[PDB]
Design a protein around this ligand. Sequence first.
Ligand code: ZN
Lengths: 333, 329
Amino acid sequence: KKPLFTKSPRNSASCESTITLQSNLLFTYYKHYFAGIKKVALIGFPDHPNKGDSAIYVAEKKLLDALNIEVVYITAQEADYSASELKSIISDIPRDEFALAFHGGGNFGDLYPDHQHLRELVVRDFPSFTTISFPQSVWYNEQQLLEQASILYAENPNITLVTRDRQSYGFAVDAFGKHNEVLLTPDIVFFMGPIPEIREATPITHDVLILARLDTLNAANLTYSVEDWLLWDPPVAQNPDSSFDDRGQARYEAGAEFLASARVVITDRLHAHILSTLMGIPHIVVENSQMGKITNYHNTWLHGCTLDGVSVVVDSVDKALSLLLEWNEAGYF
Amino acid sequence: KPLFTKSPRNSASCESTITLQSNLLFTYYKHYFAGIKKVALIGFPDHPNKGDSAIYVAEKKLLDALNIEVVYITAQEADYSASELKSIISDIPRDEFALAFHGGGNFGDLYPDHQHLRELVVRDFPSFTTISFPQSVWYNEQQLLEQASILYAENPNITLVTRDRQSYGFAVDAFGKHNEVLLTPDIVFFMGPIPEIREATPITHDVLILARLNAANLTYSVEDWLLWDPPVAQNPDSSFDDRGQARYEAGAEFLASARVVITDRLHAHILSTLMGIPHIVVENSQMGKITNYHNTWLHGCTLDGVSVVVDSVDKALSLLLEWNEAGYF
Ligand SMILES: [Zn+2]
């Protein structure tokens, strides 16, 4: 009953509506495109410390569970991929009940040839199945790399590409839109819905958390942490005998608790921004890169969460601190 | 009972696609019309184009489904009255009233009057929930784009809805700094499957060529659905609703008179899809008048017996014959 953002109740209603909209669109799109599917192989599981990519995995599980679809196989990298093992797993499954699902996020571009290569390997071993991605960021600065990657999608018109932001959508359409369906949906993590439970369960350890690149102790009676949520990793994730699911769950929960430790967050990471929004943690986001790592997504989907006490975007970390103080005297956290 | 009876398996795929588009329209507009009870429709198409009138009826249908009443309609500047609209909304709470821009292809170089009416209405009535029905949007001329951009920059509350990929990309680059821009299906898909009017209309010709070999035994008509107009639409004492309804129904019956349609019009293509009439679509222009929309939304209706796109009218005839011997119509 109570607002997601306590301390900014009227503005909270607008962002809660926006969360619900994104969650419904995800369901509506994926219910349709997974019609008839009962079992799925997940391709490109993020077996590495990035908290946002693991949160993407958990939200993918949640959506698949909501559609009564079972994950019967997972591959992270080429090294752990086995065509024989996957061939045997799907031998007993009717063709129209099985799909290939590409793990979403920012794994489609110049910097991610291994992720693309795994997609190529799996689709060519198992062609003519319902094949679709979870919502991706997509961009190639280099034509040569784009031309290479385009052959897979041209030769397999059944593959449906899902993008999560307007710039990725426009790029995907121009590059692959002749042969493949291209969609624009929200980021899958919004299917988790409001998750204030974890905000309330986690004890507050600092007043502010700075999850961004850089110091200045403006002593307005506020403690702060300048930690990075990359690098460090839950011990369970470091275990080789642990399952993919265990690693992804642990990394998601760890990342969520990490943000919950503060009353306000300053961040330049998209999924620190997304998760804080879902948990009802007030936060300022810093767009300090070119490209648009934050702003491409934000301007596509989150206009309704762009409010005082909820979430705001600024062009620098110094601007974030200034606004933080206004929020403090306003009592937004 | 399939929508496309002579292509039952392929019909299922296109019916799903219709349902998807209808649900997205509802989901988006339910959200963005939250709290709204009454609406003024701006840019009503008071002219013979059948597709634009079909857009109007679908707009009515959606508004009715959200329990929203249309309390005012303006087609052109000549019939617009600020005083009349001001008095109509005087007793309505601010947050219960919205301005709704009539959708379709009325946003670009060729449509300065449509844009001008939008400018007039928003500046007389600023700070209301303001949103468009799904539009096609493109400006070839920078000078015209720059002029039209001022309205949307000065009124950040306006939400722009586009109906295709290219329009969305254009709208985003041009207006995306200040305004929300959406990509939804074309509003006419909220009508859902309408085979009733296909079944009610008697077949007059075998083929209808609605665009710019004969025997083996196929009759054909090369009519244009512009120009001619139901007599009720020509009546000045008729209401906007009557004209729009009549023009929609007339356009629908016109397509229903054939067993197959060849067309180069987007809404002949859309309506034929909804009615379950097999048809071939011809993309004979440069702009992508058909293909921008089709490739955004209708991959699932791109099947034999349902609907196919080709680059010329000659190609359409060739495929028609394959469909005839297959028995797709
Ligand atoms: Zn004028």
